[PDB]
Request: fold
Amino acid sequence: SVRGANPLMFRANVLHMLLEFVLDNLYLNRHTGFSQDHTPFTEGANLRS
Amino acid sequence: SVRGANPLMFRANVLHMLLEFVLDNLYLNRHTGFSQDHTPFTEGANLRS
Reply:
């Protein structure tokens, strides 16, 4: 049946899915400019643009 | 007759049948290849093909 998965291949598929999940978060975070806010709930706090 | 046989030659007939029977079966067993059963029938067994 094409609409189904083998219950004997669950661990291999979940393990490869975890490898795919960890493998595309291998980036580094960039710094870009900020902006002050004077909204009365975030008064004087450099938010990130 | 085409349906009758002599009951005095049964021993020679049986001996010739046994000699045919051995001289046929003188072969060697050949290794072909195997699988792994994905179905839950007889788990993890390696089935000949």
Remarks:
- The first helix of chain B runs from residue 10 to 25.
- DSSP finds one helix and no strands in chain B.
